[PDB]
Amino acid sequence: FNILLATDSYKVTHYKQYPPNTSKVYSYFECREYEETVFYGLQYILNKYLKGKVVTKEKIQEAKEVYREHFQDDVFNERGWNYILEKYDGHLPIEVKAVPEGSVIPRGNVLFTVENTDPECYWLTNWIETILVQSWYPITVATNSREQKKILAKYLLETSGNLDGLEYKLHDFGYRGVSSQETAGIGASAHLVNFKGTDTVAGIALIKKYYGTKDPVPGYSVPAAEHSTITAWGKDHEKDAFEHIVTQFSSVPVSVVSDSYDIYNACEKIWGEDLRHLIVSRSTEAPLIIRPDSGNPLDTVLKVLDILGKKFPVSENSKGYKLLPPYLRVIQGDGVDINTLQEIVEGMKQKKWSIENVSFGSGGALLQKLTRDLLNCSFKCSYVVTNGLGVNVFKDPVADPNKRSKKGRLSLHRTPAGTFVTLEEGKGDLEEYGHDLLHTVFKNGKVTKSYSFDEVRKNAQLN
Amino acid sequence: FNILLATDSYKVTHYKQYPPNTSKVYSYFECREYEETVFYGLQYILNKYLKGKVVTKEKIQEAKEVYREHFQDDVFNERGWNYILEKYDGHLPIEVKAVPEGSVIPRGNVLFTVENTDPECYWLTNWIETILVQSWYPITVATNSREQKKILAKYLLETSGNLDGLEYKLHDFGYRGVSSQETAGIGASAHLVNFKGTDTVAGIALIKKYYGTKDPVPGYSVPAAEHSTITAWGKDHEKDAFEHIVTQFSSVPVSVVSDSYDIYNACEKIWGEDLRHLIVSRSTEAPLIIRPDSGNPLDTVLKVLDILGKKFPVSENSKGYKLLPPYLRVIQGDGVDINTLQEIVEGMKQKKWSIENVSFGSGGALLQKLTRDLLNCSFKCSYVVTNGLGVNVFKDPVADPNKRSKKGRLSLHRTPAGTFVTLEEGKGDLEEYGHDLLHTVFKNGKVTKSYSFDEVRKNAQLN
Ligand SMILES: NC(=O)c1ccc[n+]([C@@H]2O[C@H](COP(=O)(O)O)[C@@H](O)[C@H]2O)c1
Numbered sequence: 001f002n003i004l005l006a007t008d009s010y011k012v013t014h015y016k017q018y019p020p021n022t023s024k025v026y027s028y029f030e031c032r033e034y035e036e037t038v039f040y041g042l043q044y045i046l047n048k049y050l051k052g053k054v055v056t057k058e059k060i061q062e063a064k065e066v067y068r069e070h071f072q073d074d075v076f077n078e079r080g081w082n083y084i085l086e087k088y089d090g091h092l093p094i095e096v097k098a099v100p101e102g103s104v105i106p107r108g109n110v111l112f113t114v115e116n117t118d119p120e121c122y123w124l125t126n127w128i129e130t131i132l133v134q135s136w137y138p139i140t141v142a143t144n145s146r147e148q149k150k151i152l153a154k155y156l157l158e159t160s161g162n163l164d165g166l167e168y169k170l171h172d173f174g175y176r177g178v179s180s181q182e183t184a185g186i187g188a189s190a191h192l193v194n195f196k197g198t199d200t201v202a203g204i205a206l207i208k209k210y211y212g213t214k215d216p217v218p219g220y221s222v223p224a225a226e227h228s229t230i231t232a233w234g235k236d237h238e239k240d241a242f243e244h245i246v247t248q249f250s251s252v253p254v255s256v257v258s259d260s261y262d263i264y265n266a267c268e269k270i271w272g273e274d275l276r277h278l279i280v281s282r283s284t285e286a287p288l289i290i291r292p293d294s295g296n297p298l299d300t301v302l303k304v305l306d307i308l309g310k311k312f313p314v315s316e317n318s319k320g321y322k323l324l325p326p327y328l329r330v331i332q333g334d335g336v337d338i339n340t341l342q343e344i345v346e347g348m349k350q351k352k353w354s355i356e357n358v359s360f361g362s363g364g365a366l367l368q369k370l371t372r373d374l375l376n377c378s379f380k381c382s383y384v385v386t387n388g389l390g391v392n393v394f395k396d397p398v399a400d401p402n403k404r405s406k407k408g409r410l411s412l413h414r415t416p417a418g419t420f421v422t423l424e425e426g427k428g429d430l431e432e433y434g435h436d437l438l439h440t441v442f443k444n445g446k447v448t449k450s451y452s453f454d455e456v457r458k459n460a461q462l463n
Numbered sequence: 464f465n466i467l468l469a470t471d472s473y474k475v476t477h478y479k480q481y482p483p484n485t486s487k488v489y490s491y492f493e494c495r496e497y498e499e500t501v502f503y504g505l506q507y508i509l510n511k512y513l514k515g516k517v518v519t520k521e522k523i524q525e526a527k528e529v530y531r532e533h534f535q536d537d538v539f540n541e542r543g544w545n546y547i548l549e550k551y552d553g554h555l556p557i558e559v560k561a562v563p564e565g566s567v568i569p570r571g572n573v574l575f576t577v578e579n580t581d582p583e584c585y586w587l588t589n590w591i592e593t594i595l596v597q598s599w600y601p602i603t604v605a606t607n608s609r610e611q612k613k614i615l616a617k618y619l620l621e622t623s624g625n626l627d628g629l630e631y632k633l634h635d636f637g638y639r640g641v642s643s644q645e646t647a648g649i650g651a652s653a654h655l656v657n658f659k660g661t662d663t664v665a666g667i668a669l670i671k672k673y674y675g676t677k678d679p680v681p682g683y684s685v686p687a688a689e690h691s692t693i694t695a696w697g698k699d700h701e702k703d704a705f706e707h708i709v710t711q712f713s714s715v716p717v718s719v720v721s722d723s724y725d726i727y728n729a730c731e732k733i734w735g736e737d738l739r740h741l742i743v744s745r746s747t748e749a750p751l752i753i754r755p756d757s758g759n760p761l762d763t764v765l766k767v768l769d770i771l772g773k774k775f776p777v778s779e780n781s782k783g784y785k786l787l788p789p790y791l792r793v794i795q796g797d798g799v800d801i802n803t804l805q806e807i808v809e810g811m812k813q814k815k816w817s818i819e820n821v822s823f824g825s826g827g828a829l830l831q832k833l834t835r836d837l838l839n840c841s842f843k844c845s846y847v848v849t850n851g852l853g854v855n856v857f858k859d860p861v862a863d864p865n866k867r868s869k870k871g872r873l874s875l876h877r878t879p880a881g882t883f884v885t886l887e888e889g890k891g892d893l894e895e896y897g898h899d900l901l902h903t904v905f906k907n908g909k910v911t912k913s914y915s916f917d918e919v920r921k922n923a924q925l926n
């Protein structure tokens with residue numbers, strides 16, 4: 001890696017574009033005006049990319065050469081980068097205040113801030129804008145996931161009375177769908193903030209590496225099948241496939257895709273008769289998770305259930321919604337996203353079916369399929385000091401006011417009525433709204449505040 | 464990194480699910496039916512993740528311990544894995560046929576195949592499905608990028624009479640827009656397949672490191688200002704800012720955001736009257752690239768041009784389209800995506816403006832905002848050998864014919880009309896359609912064939 005080469009290119013030319021004699025550049029991160037976002041991710045980036053000794057003569061030299069050719073001109077600041085290398089052993093002379101990872105903060109608030117601690121490195125603050133801004137993803141993935149947890153909570157509760165298993169109603173199947181490996185870990189790490197059902201192994205390590213979890217299972221999964229493990233047996237041997245798999249995993253819960261060919265056939269005939277005896281015989285602690293993976297995600301669930309219900313002793317829970325015997329359950333692993341999820345869980349309700357019967361599998365819509373656009377994650381400069389003169393900076397582009405910038409130094413506060421207030425123009429000092437909720441998390445190449453994954457979860461909790 | 468825990472957690476349970484006596488499992492990848500796609504990035508994944516000794520006592524132990532916690536039951540195939548570690552010193556006993564990188568193939572075609580080379584390692588083929596399917600990304604990026612190149616070409620041509628600079632018309636900005644570092648490298652490296660304008664330094668390393676480029680660095684960049692490097696001079700000293708950066712970069716070409724406050728002001732007043740003398744003086748090989756970033760990229764470009772046209776000597780080129788004087792150009796660095804691009808470039812055309820005046824910059828629209836769903840990049844098992852005989856496998860969900868997978872041993876061939884044909888059920892063995900264009904690129908953990916980035920580039924060339 002090399003932080004010297006992990007920023008937008010033009011930012012390498014930024015140093016001489018500042019007002020002459022600007023000892024300080026102070027920028028923040030907010031979710032301009034999905035109301036409340038979960039602030040997660042920053043900690044990962046800090047440890048893996050910004051803290052410690054990030055500058056080395058070798059990394060400088062490389063930058064020089066790459067930049068001297070990228071721009072075809074040594075517009076690269078080796079001088080300024082040599083300074084950090086010597087004065088601070090390659091440690092970034094910057095301080096970063098941020099809200100506790102996992103914090104649910106309503107749109108429009110200063111989640112974190114970054115400023116240089118050395119007048120020399122005033123140009124450092126924004127350089128790492130890019131690296132830091134990449135945090136919109138972990139935030140967006142943790143936020144959208146949580147928003148899906150709410151919908152699940154809403155209906156699981158109105159249909160079962162409790163919220164048991166709520167942390168397992170959305171399984172992450174986005175490893176295969178994310179843009180890179182790193183993304184899978186990062187993204188999956190963000191889903192685990194709100195649920196414990198994940199297949200993206202990548203998420204777990206990243207957590208036991210940058211957040212830590214005392215908890216036993218930082219993420220859970222159970223044996224499941226994929227189309228190869230069924231289709232390979234040949235079309236005429238789907239039953240053989242199913243029966244081989246329910247047997248291989250009879251003592252533990254096992255999910256089994258049945259849409260390889262006609263979902264409505266595996267369900268009604270292959271599980272409805274040909275293999276009935278392999279289902280009714282299973283324990284609730286190791287049921288068969290029928291899994292459709294094609295067709296209208298809602299029409300398919302109602303049919304799957306209609307078929308299953310007409311093949312297995314469906315009871316009626318307290319609130320009056322149909323429920324399949326404890327040993328049989330469904331998992332929609334295709335076409336599930338925030339929008340879709342809501343339609344299904346609603347369609348299940350309208351059709352008097354319990355959200356207990358189903359669990360969901362979202363993949364490329366959970367991890368991949370999110371743009372910084374969503375939560376309007378933006379990193380911007382609001383305070384600068386030139387000639388000992390502090391200035392309240394900001395952008396207020398005529399043509400898009402909903403793209404204004406905060407001015408002055410910023411502070412996060414709890415209003416007297418509970419919510420949050422981001423004070424501007426350093427008005428945080430006029431101690432009125434209590435203390436700044438932003439804790440210093442990074443200072444001169446050292447992490448000054450981490451949060452176990454268990455803490456983050458607690459913070460991201462619902463209700 | 465660890466290949467043992469780099470797949471979808473449930474695949475760790477697939478071995479027990481394949482029909483007993485399965486000695487082989489042939490799996491392919493295609494973009495099921497953006498008619499033609501650029502096949503790119505598989506080489507990087509092979510090298511960065513699958514090449515060589517990927518299995519070790521440690522990796523195996525780690526997996527077991529993790530999968531032990533993840534599954535609460537030792538479902539992890541430690542034996543299957545250790546065997547690879549001994550017999551093949553940790554290299555993967557798999558072969559991978561694949562179309563040369565950069566190749567442009569229409570939908571429905573097999574771009575690559577993966578099969579186990581050792582009867583014991585039948586379970587490896589789809590184990591690496593996840594990690595390999597991630598190639599959908601660089602492909603999508605590469606494709607969508609090349610599809611935007613065509614649009615620029617289409618119009619630059621019928622507006623300027625040529626394509627000079629058609630390769631520096633889409634500049635990648637999505638570095639802060641991607642979900643992670645590794646992603647910016649991968650994706651930006653995809654864009655560089657079709658353009659040389661990148662600010663996301665990431666893609667450069669990836670290219671030099673994994674593909675190699677003889678030319679001096681794949682893509683390039685030019686010094687440009689950002690919102691902080693202008694708003695820092697205070698709202699009133701916007702002129703000072705412009706003038707400081709244009710003089711700082713009078714030498715080479717410089718881009719400067721002008722929407723910080725009224726885009727239409729900086730243009731008409733600040734650039735067209737105050738600093739008007741700093742523009743006209745500039746070199747045509749180092750002009751001032753005015754850069755809006757406000758709202759509705761179309762309406763803004765026309766006004767920017769309309770303002771700039773009325774402030775500078777607009778010349779009608781040999782095609783009838785207006786053209787600014789060599790020292791003045793514009794760029795849309797906001798709201799540009801493959802769809803938006805079209806409207807703008809055509810909105811320009813209708814309004815008799817030349818696509819010579821404006822180059823573009825796509826951010827998260829270019830690197831993020833891409834899903835496997837776009838080109839339907841899918842990795843499915845088509846052939847299996849159970850008990851010595853081969854079997855043609857495939858899935859065909861009833862509720863969705865657009866998912867039917869290919870069956871049997873596939874081979875990629877040139878039709879007699881130049882186009883392509885993915886032949887199924889080993890039919891490619893009838894010689895009838897020339898040779899199989901899919902080249903073995905991976906054999907028993909070793910890169911059997913690579914392509915330089917200059918090759919990928921040629922192959923992906925347009926027209
Ligand atoms: N049943 C499982 O455990 C499991 C795990 C990972 C991926 N998958 C499948 O992979 C696919 C991923 O596609 P999407 O990312 O578009 O959701 C889905 O069809 C999904 O069902 C299933």
Ligand SMILES: NC(=O)c1ccc[n+]([C@@H]2O[C@H](COP(=O)(O)O)[C@@H](O)[C@H]2O)c1
Pocket residue numbers: 008009010372373635636637638639640662687688718754756796797798824825826827828
């Ligand atoms: N002018 C430049 O060289 C440059 C480079 C990278 C990003 N940017 C800006 O950063 C933003 C990135 O956001 P989007 O990826 O959503 O487009 C854009 O508004 C873009 O103009 C500009």
